Design an enzyme around this catalytic site. Structure first.
Site, PDB file in Angstrom:
ATOM      1  N   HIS A 178       0.798  -1.223   0.000  1.00  0.00           N
ATOM      2  CA  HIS A 178       0.000   0.000   0.000  1.00  0.00           C
ATOM      3  C   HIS A 178       0.836   1.282   0.000  1.00  0.00           C
ATOM      4  O   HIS A 178       2.055   1.257   0.184  1.00  0.00           O
ATOM      5  CB  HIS A 178      -0.940   0.012   1.224  1.00  0.00           C
ATOM      6  CG  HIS A 178      -0.192   0.102   2.519  1.00  0.00           C
ATOM      7  ND1 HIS A 178       0.081   1.305   3.141  1.00  0.00           N
ATOM      8  CD2 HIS A 178       0.390  -0.855   3.281  1.00  0.00           C
ATOM      9  CE1 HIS A 178       0.774   1.078   4.240  1.00  0.00           C
ATOM     10  NE2 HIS A 178       0.990  -0.222   4.340  1.00  0.00           N
ATOM     11  N   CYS A 196       3.675  -4.825   6.391  1.00  0.00           N
ATOM     12  CA  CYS A 196       3.202  -4.428   5.058  1.00  0.00           C
ATOM     13  C   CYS A 196       4.345  -3.950   4.176  1.00  0.00           C
ATOM     14  O   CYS A 196       5.399  -3.566   4.664  1.00  0.00           O
ATOM     15  CB  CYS A 196       2.107  -3.353   5.132  1.00  0.00           C
ATOM     16  SG  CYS A 196       0.502  -3.913   5.767  1.00  0.00           S
TER      17      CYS A 196
END
Ligand SMILES: [Ca+2]
Length: 221
Positions: A178, A196
């Protein structure tokens, strides 16, 4: 006798999916007996054209997925039989993302050709500065597939609560590629996320817009 009745299969008939999309089989009723799972797997044997080998993983007592061992060919019509049920689906481009923990990069290729949108900046096309997990919350190595894509999704620690612009989900638990604008100084240099794969907003946007559900994401040391 209908304990192995199949309610539905993904990909759906005619669906356009990324090149690592699993074959997901949903049963009409729970198969609670783990000893009956091998018989169920045989009842739902997966035969594709082109032929492909794969492995079953039970996601719930009424859902088994067959994970192909290789990538489906891109831009193709794949014929699929699950048990006697004959279907087909289509693949789009091979959009492959490779995260390197040691290099602090996320490398994107489209049908084999590394490409990226037209701060650290590499000047090898497709090589995006990234930031993976810190030592206490590392990005696990392995082979993933894109499970979903969302905009302006809330990610919280469950300390933080983030509204994240471009979110490409790669695990059920909450691992994503992201946009991480707050994290720019780290990209290409340090691994400071919570697992992440962090990108700049512009890189995340380009990758999000390029990738499809079912496309592969590889994390390597
Ligand atoms: Ca799709």
């Amino acid at each position: 006798s209908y304990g192995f009745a199949v309610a539905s299969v993904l990909p759906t008939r005619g669906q356009v999916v990324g090149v690592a999309h699993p074959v997901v089989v949903t049963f009409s009723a729970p198969i609670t007996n783990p000893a009956n799972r091998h018989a169920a797997e045989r009842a739902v044997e997966v035969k594709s054209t082109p032929a492909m080998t794969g492995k079953f993983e039970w996601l719930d007592n009424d859902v088994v997925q067959w994970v192909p061992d290789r990538f489906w060919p891109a831009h193709s019509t794949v014929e699929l039989s699950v048990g006697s049920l004959s279907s087909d689906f289509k693949t789009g481009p091979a959009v492959v993302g490779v995260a390197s923990i040691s290099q602090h990069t996320f490398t994107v290729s489209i049908d084999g050709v590394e490409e990226g949108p037209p701060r650290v900046h590499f000047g090898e096309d497709g090589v995006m500065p990234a930031s993976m997990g810190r030592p206490e919350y590392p990005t696990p190595v392995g082979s993933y597939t894109v499970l979903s894509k969302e905009r302006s999704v809330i990610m919280d620690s469950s300390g933080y609560r983030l509204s994240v612009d471009y979110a490409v989900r790669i695990t059920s638990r909450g691992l994503y590629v992201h946009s991480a604008p707050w994290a720019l100084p780290a990209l290409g240099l340090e691994n400071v996320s919570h697992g992440c794969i962090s990108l700049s907003r512009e890189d995340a946007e380009w990758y999000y817009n390029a990738v499809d559900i079912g496309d592969p994401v590889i994390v390597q040391e």
